[PDB]
Design a binder for these strands. Structure first.
Lengths: 94, 97, 102, 89, 97, 102
DNA sequence: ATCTGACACGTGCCTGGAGACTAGGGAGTAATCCCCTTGGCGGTTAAAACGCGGGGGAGAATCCGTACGTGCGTTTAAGCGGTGCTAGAGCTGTC
DNA sequence: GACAGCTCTAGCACCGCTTAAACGCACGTACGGATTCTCCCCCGCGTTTTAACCGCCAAGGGGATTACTCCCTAGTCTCCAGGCACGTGTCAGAT
């Protein structure tokens, strides 16, 4: 019961809950999606992209550059053994 | 790989085959390495086009768009984070040569 | 590499040792765009005649091929280094392909 | 896509660091594919009798995909976000 | 693999690790082969149980049945065709020892 | 191998060269059930106490484990023969596992 | 030092995003039947661990032919760029 | 969803020109293959300890099953403002 803001502002999340619910509901997995699953999915994406952005920013700062590029995002992934296992099968742009 | 190359078709140039080994960190390359390299690039493009063409046939189109390749990429259970938008080609992009 | 405004980071002719460090710093693809389009239309000619290929589709097709080929060769280098040798041969690449598909 | 949400996170963490436009599109495609893997994991872990996805389904799906230290810290952040949302409805 | 085996917990007997090699067709096995083989099975069992526990926990049960492991098996994109039934282990089966 | 019914190929301190020929003719699992049940309950006890394991779930857990373990050891044998060696060492199995996860 | 053109910024908007009943279904709870799991005990006894000569595989050292790094020049074609054409995507509107 | 028709973004082609880049060739040196020798450790066989597995037993814990109750979420209507495209300044970074 707080009408001053959106779903992301109510949960204090920067990832939009409405877009994360659209991914979950329109994935063709199930007929019904609860309200709590939408907030939980947005928080899971938000925490670990904060992990990637923290490692990419430190990698970019160590390279004396103020703009995060593709190579800085790539170099941050294999520098963390736990992060690399999630997206090891992904194509990191050549 | 071994016999996926056929005489009569355009193939990857020999110096481009050696540059693939340099990006993998290989310090020395054999002279017979150009044959499995040319086969594997030819095999992966044959696999990618074949999946993408039947994605085009079902949608009743005649041009392979970026959505048909993307659906062909996820059909092999291979996630692709390189999605070329209209802003591609800017500076040091991953889609350039 | 030959595309305008690309981060090639290579300066003309280089030795083999300097080519490894230069290619680990660049981000551009290493197969020319014209010969990749020629191959892309040629294989599609065997299934569907007169099929146009979009420029956005060509970039995504080349990126997938580059990442899959480099991943195979990095695996092919491991077999070469496991056999106490420093020269990648044709048998090493075929062994690396067979160890994942077959 | 998650372009604006991921840009606002970078301002909170590193106030003096910007992001390439091409890098922002790749980070957005990570977010979509991370959403797809968790949601597909949550559908798999559901029993055949049940048909809806609750918060407990996404919590256990994040634990399976994320190993060791990341998985334990995931559940703490997800639960704290749900309890904050459950009191400010 | 190398450090996934720990003292204090039960492991595979030494002879059964050599039997796993002979099923693969190996003729000669080194003396320090038991440690990686014990590590891989203990890793694969830890992977399978961890997925199976959360499927059981979400269904509010207390016993890991065949449906929980089946959801655990294909969550790792591994198709399984040896699904046991009530007639399993009859004369010579894929489930006997 | 020690259960009732059938599935055993050959016993009696049978030699190593004959063991490869015999093990390709049998169909039963080669890990004891009691030691596997003790193993399976021990992994669960570290994370959740008082977990019962079904008898049908035990059989299908063991079938997946050996099929993944034998598949790894077959890949480890290829690298051993690629290095012109006939004896599987510790480094060959570590290389075989590294080539697919890493 | 000097471009440059890609990113940050300002504006229009319309379609995504949020709020308020409704009710019907699916989730949760509780009692009850009994199926299947744990524990184990006598005995087996086949398999597992342990120990001891003995030979075959791996490692080390030496030698060398030949296959690959490497300058150097010649040769071929990939790409800017600009142009022009038009085949064919996108969207609308039935039925 | 198939079909028709109008609109217009974009893919093909080509010529000029450039020029970075690929191919070929001669010189030479490092390296994998061949050979011999030696070490050491693993297969083969005998013995002994030990624990996996039969049958068969029993108690009972919790999986199915059914019935009741009620939490909430797809659906429909209404309202609104926030992110996205278009266009433009200007400074992060390559040279």
């Amino acid at each position: 019961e707080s009408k001053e803001g959106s779903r992301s502002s109510k949960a204090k999340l920067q990832i939009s809950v409405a877009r994360s619910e659209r991914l979950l509901r329109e994935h063709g997995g199930c007929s019904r999606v609860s309200e709590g699953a939408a907030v939980a999915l947005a928080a899971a994406i938000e925490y670990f992209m904060g992990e990637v952005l923290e490692l990419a920013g430190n990698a970019a700062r160590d390279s004396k550059k103020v703009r995060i590029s593709v190579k800085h995002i790539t170099l941050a992934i294999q520098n963390d053994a736990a992060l690399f296992a999630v997206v090891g099968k992904g194509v990191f742009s050549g | 790989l071994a016999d996926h190359v056929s005489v009569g078709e355009t193939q990857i140039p020999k110096a481009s085959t050696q540059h693939l080994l340099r990006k993998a960190g290989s310090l020395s390359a054999a002279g017979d390495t150009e044959v499995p390299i040319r086969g594997f690039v030819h095999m992966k493009l044959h696999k990618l086009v074949q999946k993408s063409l039947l994605a085009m046939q079902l949608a009743k189109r005649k041009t392979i768009m970026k959505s048909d390749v993307k659906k062909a990429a996820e059909l092999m259970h291979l996630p692709v984070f390189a999605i070329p938008t209209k802003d591609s080609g800017a500076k040091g992009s991953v889609f350039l040569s | 590499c030959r595309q305008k405004g690309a981060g090639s980071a290579g300066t003309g002719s280089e030795t083999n040792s300097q080519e490894v460090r230069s290619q680990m710093r660049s981000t551009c693809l290493i197969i020319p765009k014209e010969r990749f389009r020629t191959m892309a239309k040629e294989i599609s000619k065997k299934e569907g005649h007169d099929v146009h290929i979009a420029e956005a589709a060509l970039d995504m097709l080349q990126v997938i091929v580059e990442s899959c080929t480099v991943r195979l060769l990095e695996k092919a280098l491991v077999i070469t280094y496991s056999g106490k040798r420093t020269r990648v041969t044709s048998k090493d690449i075929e062994t690396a392909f067979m160890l994942e598909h077959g | 896509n998650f372009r604006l949400g991921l840009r606002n996170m970078l301002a909170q963490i590193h106030p003096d660091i910007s992001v390439q436009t091409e890098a922002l599109s790749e980070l957005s495609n990570i977010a979509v594919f991370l959403g797809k893997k968790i949601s597909h994991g949550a559908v798999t872990l559901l029993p055949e009798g049940t048909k809806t996805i609750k918060s407990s389904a996404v919590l256990l799906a994040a634990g399976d995909l994320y190993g060791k230290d990341l998985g334990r810290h995931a559940v703490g952040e997800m639960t704290k976000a749900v309890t904050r949302y459950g009191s400010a409805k």
